[PDB]
Amino acid sequence: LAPNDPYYQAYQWHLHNATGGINAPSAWDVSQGEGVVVAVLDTGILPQHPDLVGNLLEGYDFISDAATSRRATNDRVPGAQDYGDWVENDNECYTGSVAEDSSWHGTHVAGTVAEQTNNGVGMAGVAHKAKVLPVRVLGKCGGYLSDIADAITWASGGTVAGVPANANPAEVINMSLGGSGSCDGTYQDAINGAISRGTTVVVAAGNETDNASKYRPASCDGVVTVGATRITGGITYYSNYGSRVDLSGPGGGGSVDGNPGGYVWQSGSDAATTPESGSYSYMGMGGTSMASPHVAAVAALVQSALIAAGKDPLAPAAMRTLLKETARPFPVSIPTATPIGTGIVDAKAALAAALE
Ligand SMILES: [Ca+2]
């Protein structure tokens, strides 16, 4: 499928480039992810972005701190509106932190997952007939481990005190987020719960040019940890690495690869603070945060295709094994000491093997 989105051909090398892309055109001839729910645990969403409407569920906001959420109270609330994660001043988040504008990170990641495609508007997305369940866990200066753990439980169909039962349990969780520290009990138990309910958990390896074993949730057991490659098919300068990394997706190499080829392109906003300070746009961002949703959406294409053929969905372990075994070996040598998994996720090869 060669969709008609105006910016797809020029910008979206991560979808269609022969060395650095995920082989999406051919995969789309087989599945678009219809009938699957991918939970995006992230900064929230711009629910009325014109290139996302139609593919979103209401979701929920698990941030339990008014200063972080920019809401009126410390309560968790329905919906996942991103209020903006900007920070006005240096050193507000930690020593040497630098002031920055709102990211709309969650809207970009949700775009990779399920941006409306072949609709004559903006960009394409990978599992563009799936639905995104936006679960807001990150705001000003990031988020809280206990919030993120409860979001994992709820997203995957588990019960959380004080939140109404999730009517839309997710077959796939994407966590484009990370922090220092090896995986603890709280994270691990929530992840184990999600796995026990059949949910595949896909996480970003992290951007510290360091061993993924030292960060969470990258280092958790049972998850798919995703490194980042460039348009060239080689490791990015920032990607974490190590034996915990299962495979990679296109994260964008940054300035070395120029514009557009250094960045992943999706729905976003140019707003610097609140949503109202700017307007809907398409933004280029680089990171393992951009690689992870490519792999999460391929998981959604596979589950969709199985369901469509009256076959059983894969269990989480089988899903990880499949994504690894079908990854495209890297077209540039990866150094021995910085392994980033078996290859770049290959949407078509994953579908072909699942449907054999
Ligand atoms: Ca579009």
Numbering used by the authors: 1 to 356
The paper states:
Besides the seven parallel β-sheets forming the core, StmPr1 shows only antiparallel β-sheet formations in β2/β3, β6/β8, and β11/β12, all located on the fringes of the structure and therefore supporting the structural stability in most loop-rich regions of the protein. The protein also has two disulfide bonds, Cys93 - Cys141 and Cys183 - Cys220. Cys93-Cys141 links the loop connecting β1 and α5 to a loop covering the catalytic triad, beginning directly behind β3 at Gly79 and going to Ser103 on top of α4. Thereby, it strengthens the connection of the loop to the core structure helping to form a kind of lid above the substrate binding cleft. This lid is a loop insertion, not present in subtilisin BPN’24 Proteinase K26 Thermitase27 or subtilisin Carlsberg28. The lid may facilitate and support two distinct functions, on the one hand, the lid may move to block the entry into the substrate binding cleft, thereby preventing unwanted binding to the catalytic triad. The StmPr1 protease exhibits some special and additional structural features, like a relatively high content of Glu and Asp residues and a relatively low content of Arg and Lys residues on the surface, which may give the enzyme the ability to be active in an alkaline environment.
This study will present a structural analysis of StmPr1, S. maltophilia’s main virulence factor, an excreted serine protease. StmPr1 is a member of the subtilases family defined by Siezen & Leunissen et al.. It shows the main structural and functional elements of the family, such as a reactive triad consisting of Asp42, His105, and Ser28922. The catalytic triad consisting of Asp42, His105, and Ser289 is located on top of β1 (Asp42), α4 (His105), and α10 (Ser289).
